[PDB]
Amino acid sequence: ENAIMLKRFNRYPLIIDPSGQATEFIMNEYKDRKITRTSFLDDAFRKNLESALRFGNPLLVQDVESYDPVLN
Amino acid sequence: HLLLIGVSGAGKTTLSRFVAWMNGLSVYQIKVHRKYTGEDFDEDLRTVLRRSGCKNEKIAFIMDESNVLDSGFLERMNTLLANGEVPGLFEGDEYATLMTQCKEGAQKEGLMLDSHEELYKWFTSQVIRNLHVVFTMNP
Amino acid sequence: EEFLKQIREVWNTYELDLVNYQNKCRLIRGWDDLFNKVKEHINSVSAMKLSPYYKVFEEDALSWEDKLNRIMALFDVWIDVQRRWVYLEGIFTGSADIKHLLPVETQRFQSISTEFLALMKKVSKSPLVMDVLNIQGVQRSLERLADLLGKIQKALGEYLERERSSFPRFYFVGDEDLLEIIGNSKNVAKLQKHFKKMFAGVSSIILNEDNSVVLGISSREGEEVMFKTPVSITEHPKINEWLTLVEKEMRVTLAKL
Amino acid sequence: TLNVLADSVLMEQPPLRRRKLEHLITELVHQRDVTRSLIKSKIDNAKSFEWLSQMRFYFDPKQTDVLQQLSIQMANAKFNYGFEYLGVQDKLVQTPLTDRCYLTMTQALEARLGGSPFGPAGTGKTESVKALGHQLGRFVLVFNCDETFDFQAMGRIFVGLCQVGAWGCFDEFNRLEERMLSAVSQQVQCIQEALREHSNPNYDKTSAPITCELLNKQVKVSPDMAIFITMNNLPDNLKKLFRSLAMTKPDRQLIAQVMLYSQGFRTAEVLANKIVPFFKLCDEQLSSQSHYDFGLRALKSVLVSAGNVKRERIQKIKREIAENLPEQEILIQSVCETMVPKLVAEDIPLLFSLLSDVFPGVQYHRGEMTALREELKKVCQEMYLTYGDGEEVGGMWVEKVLQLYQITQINHGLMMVGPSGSGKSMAWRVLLKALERLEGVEGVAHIIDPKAISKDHLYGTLDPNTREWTDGLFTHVLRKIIDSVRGELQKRQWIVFDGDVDPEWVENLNSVLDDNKLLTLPNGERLSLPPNVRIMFEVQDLKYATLATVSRCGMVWFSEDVLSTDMIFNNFLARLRSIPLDSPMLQIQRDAATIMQPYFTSNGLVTKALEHAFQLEHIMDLTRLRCLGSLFSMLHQACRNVAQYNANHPDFPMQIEQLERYIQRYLVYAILWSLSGDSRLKMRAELGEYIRRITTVPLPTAPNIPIIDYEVSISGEWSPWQAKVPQIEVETHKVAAPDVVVPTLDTVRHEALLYTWLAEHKPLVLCGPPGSGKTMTLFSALRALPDMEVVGLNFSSATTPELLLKTFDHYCEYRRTPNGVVLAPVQLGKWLVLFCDEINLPDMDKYGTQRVISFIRQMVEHGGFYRTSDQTWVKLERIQFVGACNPPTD
Amino acid sequence: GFNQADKAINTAVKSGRWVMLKNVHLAPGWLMQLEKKLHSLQPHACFRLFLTMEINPKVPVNLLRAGRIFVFEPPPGVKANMLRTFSSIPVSRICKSPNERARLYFLLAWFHAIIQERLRYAPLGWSKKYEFGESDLRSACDTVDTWLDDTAKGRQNISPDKIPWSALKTLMAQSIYGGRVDNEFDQRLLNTFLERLFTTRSFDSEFKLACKVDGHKDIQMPDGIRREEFVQWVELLPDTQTPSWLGLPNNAERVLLTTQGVDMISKMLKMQAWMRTLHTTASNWLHLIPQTLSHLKRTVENIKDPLFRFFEREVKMGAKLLQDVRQDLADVVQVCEGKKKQTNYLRTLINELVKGILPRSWSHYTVPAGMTVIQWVSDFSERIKQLQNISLAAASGGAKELKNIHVCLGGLFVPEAYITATRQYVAQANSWSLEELCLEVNVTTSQGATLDACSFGVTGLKLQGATCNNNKLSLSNAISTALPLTQLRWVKQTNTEKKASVVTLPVYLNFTRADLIFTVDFEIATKEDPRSFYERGVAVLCT
Ligand SMILES: Nc1ncnc2c1ncn2[C@@H]1O[C@H](COP(=O)(O)OP(=O)(O)OP(=O)(O)O)[C@@H](O)[C@H]1O
Ligand SMILES: Nc1ncnc2c1ncn2[C@@H]1O[C@H](COP(=O)(O)OP(=O)(O)OP(=O)(O)O)[C@@H](O)[C@H]1O
Ligand SMILES: Nc1ncnc2c1ncn2[C@@H]1O[C@H](COP(=O)(O)OP(=O)(O)O)[C@@H](O)[C@H]1O
Ligand SMILES: Nc1ncnc2c1ncn2[C@@H]1O[C@H](COP(=O)(O)OP(=O)(O)O)[C@@H](O)[C@H]1O
Ligand SMILES: [Mg+2]
């Protein structure tokens, strides 16, 4: 059901998994699209995020507890 | 100045922008990020005051509770809303540019520039007449 | 476009601030502001590369990026070439006995400082950032000086370690303290301040009229122990040997007493 | 030998010979105790463990090597005396706990283990290790772990310990940070493994040198080195390498007895058996305070002070055998002289009750100090203060002054602590003037506010690139004193650090307060404290100060009961009767003071009204001195109004009866507007009702309108404020203007109060709920005056003194023509009022203080500030402060 | 070893061999890095990694979760411990020098086992849980070796009376084993054991290692000369080891079981819809705890009385804690019904309360380790009731009635302050000094007997291991013999030596012997001896 929600979403998903099963699943599903790993704690994250909006590259951001308002 | 209290997504920002677009006022949105600091907020306040006081352009200041990070932003805006102008924003070259643009606005409107104090009073009157702030927050 | 115009104006009107250093040259002041501006411009140009309207200005932006990088590639070295030199300066002119202890590195530092002063004189005649960057081979000489300063600093640290090994009690005093001790060996007045850090109770040395023989030791409370056989600094001028003689004679005098 | 030494210590001896005498007495007492019982219990064999357990010294002068001449043996452990010069160190009394510590430590060293004497702080673990090390003539290094820790130094320190062969003791290993603890434990483990391999049974004949891996290099480990880890558990690495020891309960009774015997007391046992339980009681029965210290070190200091007092008494009696002295009286005199100055007013009766319980029927007589008392009385008379002896009014304050003088003699680095409103500044000012007049030595005081400026500006800064050192405030002051180009020496220089104390700006001062008296600047220069310089800390609460700073400073505690209200009233009346507010003005002031004297009595109207107002609810914490200062300023304005009325009527001026009526009613008006003048309407009405109940002066006869709504006219009758409110007609386009103010009862009342409190340049704050009209009314009243230039400063959450400095640079100028630099407004004849609204907004730092608030307090109380550019004292002229803020609960 | 282990694990996961890392608890960060490195795929299936370590909290949680844990504990018993000690010591060390050495080692081993087996009965038997690990045994063995070599130069058999018994006793009492002992009363027990075992009588055939075991049986000393005889005697020990082997009363085992049972319940309580039961529990606590007591103190007159000031402080502290607990429980009641908002602090108390752990903000006085919340609130209620009686007595008559009050020490927050105040009052009366007053204890039968001058009444004192009849102590099997009414009399010291028929019993505060209040000099029956009182853990307890 969670994979179904990830496939059919209108608002960008927020994955909450104590383990890394969902994270690794979303990588292995999106390797052909070159999913990029980032985090809100990373200083270069914004730059990476900028690139994600240019070449149509999916982007993963971890540690959403320290949410970046620039993503609004 | 208007404060909009309610749950997020209720349409406060959208309705405010809709009314501002209908009434002709421009909309100014502060673009905040993780690296946002007090000096950036001061520069945004300077820009909006310059566009609202020196020029007769009317501006609807869009702010949300998210855009406020520290108490300095809130205190600067409290001064702006209550007194109509922030005394410490313009310093040095910024003050000189303010006076030059105020003289330009006075001669455009048909007023005599006179001294710095009268020009600043005219700028404050223009700001309180040509600047409106809407603050959106959750209860 | 106006962003590139701002970059052009800023970097064509930017001047390197210079402040006098002991009436010897003028060192660059304001590294923090210059590095902040360089980082801001580099990040802004990197995002400008990411902007969609960038292909129109692409080539121009690229040029500035290169210039910016070159500026960066200069100044990160330059401050280093300054700092170490200043440090070395504080070691190589505040003392007169460093020359005898470290002659080869003294000559190398004099040769390095001649070129460094010449480069500073050249910079002072044209403090503009673009003018400074365009001088023939600034980065080459700067990196040569940086490597030379690193090598001579390593040699000085090795000599300090050798001095500590010769007299193990020097391990208690600091590196700057040991530099002061070895550099100011001739004037014993500067040694007495640190003498309470090596020995258990010794706080000063009772010397002769000409400070040539160490007659005895003196504690902090004023108690004085007179050596049975006085030790002479003229016969043993190097710091380690005569300090070891002082310690051994102190033990012998305590035993006889 | 003990009798000879005890006879010798009773006479006058040089300090070095005195230290040698007491060391000899201590060791001979230990030898007497060992031989008398531990060897005389039917012991006849030299190999019996009853004698092998004691530390035996064997001297063989025939040995050629110096290190092999003397051998120190305890049980099966044998050590060689290192013959290191120790100078004159403090000797430890050989208590049975110390004997067991020596035995355990020597057993651990013989087995090539380390020592870990764990135990509660203050039991002498580190001192025991140091004494053992000094007994064997080995250099002992103590590494305190109270954030004064550094790997870059201690790696090479460990290398040096392994090389030369010295001892290393850690003050408290658990104080270490986890990473720091683990890494230093790794180093200690390597060193201790090398030490253990130094005693391999198969490799006892060490041919290849036993070395350890220190600083990533091979370091030879001397067999005589040792590492002691004093604790209060051990890391898992060092559990199998270190022998522990429980140093839990020191033998305080034996220590005190031996020290008192060494001091010359002939009744040492009884005195110790009294003084140890007494100190336990003081630690328990007395209240808990940060600056209280009843540990073993304090007991030792008290005992040596008692010995000094007994010797001084012996000398005094001799110049006018002698064993009939009251030793108990001397002991309690020393105890009181050491403890009472730092005792809160609550604990003094408790301390004296404890002394009576332990020392029954033995009383304390304080020093007369009449020579200083005469000069104190003269200075207080010329300074409009109140002086009294003992039970008289001002007795506690003058006794605090005398205690401050005693601690001035005893040591440098004083600390005057006490709640705000006590006689702290006046005490040391009067003491300085009295010392100047008595000893003939001019006294100069430098009052420095530390929190007003940054630490870099306080001490000085080194240029990051130029490596050029520019000295700060304290550094410049000390350098000027030391150089003495004008001759700063031969003058009593007092560097008073008025303000708050936190562990940040006192770091460099720690090396000055202690016996070092040595300020170590970052550039390398070392400034030596001259004997005529005392560093005073005038603080308020002593709440954010580390124990290191407090323990290094003699302390006098100024409780609020020291400065009674009668003293404040007497000072106010004396200043009114002497100081002219502007001869006819002085005559008016004298008449007014004569009129209001009956109300300023012990149980007069003002005292009862203050007591009742303390019960009311105020928006800000009611302080006695704020209240009294507001009342005094209002009375001064009443005298000014009388003078103005006399000026307006050159013929038939104010008569005695009209002045009496006016002053009597204005006193109640000022009491109402100053007492509970910062409270709600209900509290003002309650205080007015209480005043009406207790006073006899005529009051507004109307029973419906509160007294707060009335005012005192110059004719001497109560007139409603509503009569003074005009009806204003404002233009159509000015309706609800941002600046227009319509006069009303509150507006006119606050304007009158504003003018009253600004005539004396007293800063004032308008507190109230948002929208109540504080900023508008304050601005309108300030701009109404023609000679006043108003500058508005909004205090944000990040306000710093730099904003005030920028405002001064923009609006004011520095003029060097007067005696000192004077900061004055550019416009002539204009008083610059810095209306700082939202005055309470600036954030408190980590230690509960606001830098800008302390800055304004310094420039208001003292009248000037120190310019960080050239470390000079500029004096404010024609500069005034006014504030406004929301309630602190918001 | 880090690089060696990394290389070893690499080659072992390549080839397929096994790698052991011993004592990995000393490298927590390295353990975390090892967990991260091992998380990758391991090519070989025959490879095994073992991490032998000690149970310490420094180990990473991730490594514990990612592997299979195996807990190993030593078997209980004197016989097993002595077998382990004899196996650890090499045969060469024991069979060397004078043959007496072997016997000495046996004694040492026995001694070690005793002082280790008494550790399981932690409160009664050793007060605290000392380490007494292998290192102490190695140090004791080294001391024995060195001193026997020193005294007996030749290999010939040294006479048993020529053995340095004093040296061994003093070095294993002051140093080594007694190094970690802090309180005096455990040092007394250790000295008793050392003087009983390490003596010249141990080499005779009639020596008794343990007496009165199981009533009449005694552990006779083996008659051997070599190590083989002693190890065979150890292997012949009966399985029926009662605590009397350690000198402890036989009931101590029972006591231990009781504690263990309670522990189990607590653990079950620690591992258990909650709003209703929390609400009813909190409401029952409000009904149980007294509502409010007011400070009726600070009288200017009679302030000189020490009991006055001490009871003022006690009343203030008790009232403060009472108000705190009452307000917090009312807040819990409100949040259970959803009538108020829940904050972080309230989250802390509710989480602590549901599991059965007392709130740290509630513990303002000395508290027995791991006391369950209901016990805490019942004890608190008793304390407030006693304080209310104190306040009522003070109000009715003044500070004079404050003296004639049978205050229980356990109820007071600081009983030591009460003892000090009693001493000060007895000094103030008759005008004595505190140094000249000594405490004399008289256990009277009447709970409200007359208090004569210096005599002060105390209730609730519980004597463990002995019964007091007519102030004379007698050993008993039953535990916690309550004392009817303790009269503490501060009498002027006569400067005399206490007779050998008295014992200095500690008076601890709670059943966990962690806080010492004072000591009592009690006369014993003529049949018993003070050493039996010392080694059986007889003590007085306030609660
Ligand atoms: N005999 C007296 N001794 C001291 N102060 C007196 C005396 N008589 C009257 N006073 C008044 O009492 C006050 C004492 O204030 P003082 O300067 O000693 O306080 P402070 O502790 O330095 O102040 P702060 O509260 O800012 O810490 C002054 O207003 C002074 O005029
Ligand atoms: N006496 C008065 N005359 C004229 N206007 C008044 C008066 N009292 C209140 N007001 C009005 O009430 C408001 C108060 O304005 P102002 O900003 O001065 O309030 P404040 O209480 O000082 O504010 P804050 O607490 O936010 O600093 C204004 O709209 C002002 O016109
Ligand atoms: N009256 C409305 N009818 C339909 N959609 C609305 C209305 N008001 C708001 N929305 C939707 O809500 C979304 C976000 O609203 P927004 O203005 O961000 O809310 P808020 O002011 O709480 O931030 C928009 O995409 C808009 O489509
Ligand atoms: N046996 C002793 N005889 C005399 N003074 C002692 C003795 N033991 C401790 N002291 C005193 O106690 C003071 C504090 O002891 P210290 O070693 O600092 O305790 P800690 O072990 O907690 O560091 C020292 O100044 C020392 O003079
Ligand atoms: Mg305002």
d(CA B81, CA B134) in angstroms, rounded, equals 11
Contact flag D796-B72 (C-beta cutoff 8 Å): yes
Q: Could you give the C-alpha distances from E361 to C94, C202, E321, E372, E454, in angstroms and in order?
A: 61, 53, 9, 15, 39
Torsion sign across C-alpha atoms E117, E118, E120, E126:
negative
d(CA C139, CA C151) in angstroms, rounded, equals 18
> In 3D, which of E285, E258, E461, E460 has the Cα closest to residue E358?
E285
**DSSP H/E element including B28:** strand B26-29
Alpha-helical runs (H) found in E121-244: 123-126, 134-151, 165-173, 184-197, 227-235
Touching status, chains A and E (3+ beta-carbon pairs under 8 Å):
no
| Own/partner long-range contacts of D2-5 (Cβ < 8 Å, ≥24 apart) | D2/D28, D2/D29, D2/D32
d(CA D806, CA D793) in angstroms, rounded, equals 11
**DSSP H/E element including D492:** strand D492-496
Method: cryo-EM
Q: For residue C174, list chain D residues with Cβ-Cβ distance below 8 A.
A: 153
Torsion sign across C-alpha atoms E261, E267, E271, E277:
positive
d(CA D151, CA C217) in angstroms, rounded, equals 31
> In 3D, which of D299, D315, D243, D347 has the Cα closest to residue D11?
D315
d(CA D838, CA E464) in angstroms, rounded, equals 67
**Tokens standing for residue C8:** 């052009």
Cβ of residue A30 closer than 8 Å to a chain B Cβ: no
Atom of ligand 2 nearest to the CA of D747: 1
- Contact B11 CB / ligand 3 (< 6 Å): yes
Smallest Cβ–Cβ distance between C223 and the set D88, D139, D466 belongs to D88
- Contact D172 CB / ligand 4 (< 6 Å): no
Contacts of D684 (CB under 8 A, 6+ apart): D672, D676, D677, D706, D708
**Tokens standing for residue E25:** 């608890």
- Contact D774 CB / ligand 2 (< 6 Å): yes
How many residues belong to chain C? Answer: 257
Contacts of E59 (CB under 8 A, 6+ apart): E24, E25, E28, E31, E53
Minimal C-alpha gap between A54 and chain C (Å) = 8
Residue D219: strand pairing partners: D212
Burial D271-282 (b: 16+ CB within 10 A, else e): bbbbbbbbbbbb
Residue whose entry in the numeric block shows the structure tokens 């102190």: C250
Alpha-helical runs (H) found in D680-793: 681-694, 745-758, 774-784
CB D825 within 8 A of CB D810: no
Supply φ then ψ for residue E541, to 5 degrees: -130, 140
- Contact D841 CB / ligand 2 (< 6 Å): no
CB E484 within 8 A of CB E469: no
How crowded is residue D767: how many other Cβ atoms within 10 Å of its Cβ?
18
DSSP letter (8 states) at residue D146: S
Instruction: Give the side-chain half-sphere CA count within 13 A for E291.
Output: 0
Q: Could you give the C-alpha distances from D509 to C33, D450, D517, in angstroms and in order?
A: 33, 12, 9
Minimal C-alpha gap between C52 and chain A (Å) = 8
Closest C-alpha to ligand 3, atom 7: B11
| Own/partner long-range contacts of D512-519 (Cβ < 8 Å, ≥24 apart) | D512/D413, D513/D412, D513/D413, D513/D549, D513/D552, D513/D553, D514/D552, D517/D412, D519/D475, D519/D478
**D775 appears as a binding residue in the annotation:** yes
Contact flag B128-D738 (C-beta cutoff 8 Å): yes
DSSP 3-state assignment of E93? Answer: helix
Residue whose entry in the numeric block shows the structure tokens 């004399």: E440
The residue type of C205 is I
Strands D822-825 and D872-876: parallel
> In 3D, which of B60, B84, B33, B82 has the Cα closest to residue B136?
B60
Q: Could you give the C-alpha distances from D788 to D443, D634, D758, D825, in angstroms and in order?
A: 38, 20, 10, 11
CB E228 within 8 A of CB E334: no
Contact flag D792-B87 (C-beta cutoff 8 Å): yes
How crowded is residue C48: how many other Cβ atoms within 10 Å of its Cβ?
19
CB E464 within 8 A of CB E537: yes
Smallest Cβ–Cβ distance between C171 and the set D88, D159, D466 belongs to D159
d(CA D716, CA D638) in angstroms, rounded, equals 11
d(CA D280, CA D287) in angstroms, rounded, equals 13
> In 3D, which of C2, D52, D735, D361 has the Cα closest to residue E151?
D52
Residue whose entry in the numeric block shows the structure tokens 């040769």: C111
Touching status, chains D and C (3+ beta-carbon pairs under 8 Å):
yes
- Contact D211 CB / ligand 1 (< 6 Å): no
CB D356 within 8 A of CB D541: no
CB D793 within 8 A of CB D803: yes
CB B51 within 8 A of CB B85: no
**D440 appears as a binding residue in the annotation:** no
**D770 appears as a binding residue in the annotation:** yes
**Tokens standing for residue D827:** 């416009």
Touching status, chains C and E (3+ beta-carbon pairs under 8 Å):
no
- Contact B16 CB / ligand 3 (< 6 Å): no
Resolution value, angstrom units: 3.2
Q: Could you give the C-alpha distances from D828 to D789, D825, D875, in angstroms and in order?
A: 11, 7, 17
Residue E490: strand pairing partners: E439
Cβ of residue B24 closer than 8 Å to a chain A Cβ: no
How crowded is residue D343: how many other Cβ atoms within 10 Å of its Cβ?
24
d(CA D124, CA D94) in angstroms, rounded, equals 12
d(CA D389, CA D394) in angstroms, rounded, equals 7
> In 3D, which of E456, E455, E473, E457 has the Cα closest to residue E465?
E473
Using most ligand atoms within 8 A of CB, pick from B5, B12, B14, B63 the residue to mutate for ligand 3.
Answer: B14
What is the separation of C-alpha E445 from the centre of its chain, rounded to a whole number of angstroms?
30
Contact flag C46-A47 (C-beta cutoff 8 Å): yes
- How many helical (H) and strand (E) elements, i.e. helices and strands, does chain A have? 3, 2
User: D632: exposed, middle or buried (C-beta count within 10 Å: 0-12, 13-18, 19+)?
Assistant: buried
Cβ of residue C46 closer than 8 Å to a chain A Cβ: yes
CB D561 within 8 A of CB D422: no
The residue type of D460 is G
What is the separation of C-alpha C111 from the centre of its chain, rounded to a whole number of angstroms?
16
DSSP 3-state assignment of D466? Answer: coil
Rg of chain D's alpha carbons, rounded to an integer? 35
Q: Could you give the C-alpha distances from D419 to A28, D540, D560, D611, in angstroms and in order?
A: 69, 5, 6, 18
**Tokens standing for residue D760:** 């004396």
- Among chain D, residues having any CB pair with chain C shorter than 8 Å are 16, 19, 66-67, 69, 82-89, 134, 139-141, 153, 156-157, 159-160, 163-164, 465-467, 524, 526
d(CA C243, CA C233) in angstroms, rounded, equals 9
CB D428 within 8 A of CB D404: yes
Helix/strand/coil percent split, chain B, to 5:
55, 15, 30
Contacts of A12 (CB under 8 A, 6+ apart): none
How many residues belong to chain B? Answer: 139
Minimal C-alpha gap between A52 and chain B (Å) = 17
Contacts of D655 (CB under 8 A, 6+ apart): none
d(CA C28, CA D55) in angstroms, rounded, equals 66
Torsion of CA E301, E302, E303, E309, to 10 degrees: -130
* Closest ligand, as measured to the CA of D853: 1
**Tokens standing for residue E200:** 């010249």
DSSP 3-state assignment of E26? Answer: helix
Residue E458: strand pairing partners: E486
DSSP 3-state assignment of D275? Answer: helix
**B38 appears as a binding residue in the annotation:** no
**DSSP H/E element including D712:** strand D710-712
DSSP per-residue letters across D290-358 = SS---SHHHHHHHHHHHHHHHHHHHHHHHT-------HHHHHHHHHHHHHGGG--TTHHHHHHHHHHHH
> ∠ CA(E147), CA(E153), CA(E158), 5° rounding?
80
- Ligand 5 ion: nearby residues, β-carbon < 5 Å: D 775
CB E438 within 8 A of CB E518: no
CB D468 within 8 A of CB D879: no
Strands D710-712 and D718-720: antiparallel
**B11 appears as a binding residue in the annotation:** yes
What is the separation of C-alpha D568 from the centre of its chain, rounded to a whole number of angstroms?
24
d(CA D321, CA D314) in angstroms, rounded, equals 10
CB E472 within 8 A of CB E523: yes
d(CA E381, CA E292) in angstroms, rounded, equals 11
Q: Could you give the C-alpha distances from C167 to C117, D218, D718, in angstroms and in order?
A: 37, 16, 91
HEC sequence for D789-851: EEEEEECCCCCCHHHHHHHHHHHEEEECCCCCCEEEECCCCCEEEEEEECCCCCCCCCCCCCH
The residue type of D809 is D
How many residues belong to chain E? Answer: 543
Q: Angle between the D347-358 and D327-339 helix axes, to the nearest 10 degrees?
A: 160
Contact flag D236-E434 (C-beta cutoff 8 Å): no
d(CA E290, CA E318) in angstroms, rounded, equals 11
Contact flag C251-D83 (C-beta cutoff 8 Å): yes
d(CA C138, CA C144) in angstroms, rounded, equals 10
d(CA E47, CA E37) in angstroms, rounded, equals 15
d(CA E522, CA D152) in angstroms, rounded, equals 59
Residue whose entry in the numeric block shows the structure tokens 């609204």: D837
CB E159 within 8 A of CB E103: no
d(CA D195, CA D186) in angstroms, rounded, equals 14
Contacts of E392 (CB under 8 A, 6+ apart): none
Backbone discontinuities in chain B, residue before each (C to N > 2.5 A): none
DSSP 3-state assignment of D261? Answer: helix
Closest C-alpha to ligand 2, atom 30: D773
Smallest Cβ–Cβ distance between D236 and the set E26, E139, E150 belongs to E26
**B53 appears as a binding residue in the annotation:** no
Burial D784-797 (b: 16+ CB within 10 A, else e): eeeebbbbbbbbbb
d(CA D762, CA E474) in angstroms, rounded, equals 81
Closest C-alpha to ligand 3, atom 23: B9
CB D16 within 8 A of CB C223: yes
How crowded is residue E338: how many other Cβ atoms within 10 Å of its Cβ?
9
Contact flag D775-B82 (C-beta cutoff 8 Å): yes
Torsion sign across C-alpha atoms D118, D119, D120, D125:
negative
d(CA E174, CA D590) in angstroms, rounded, equals 81
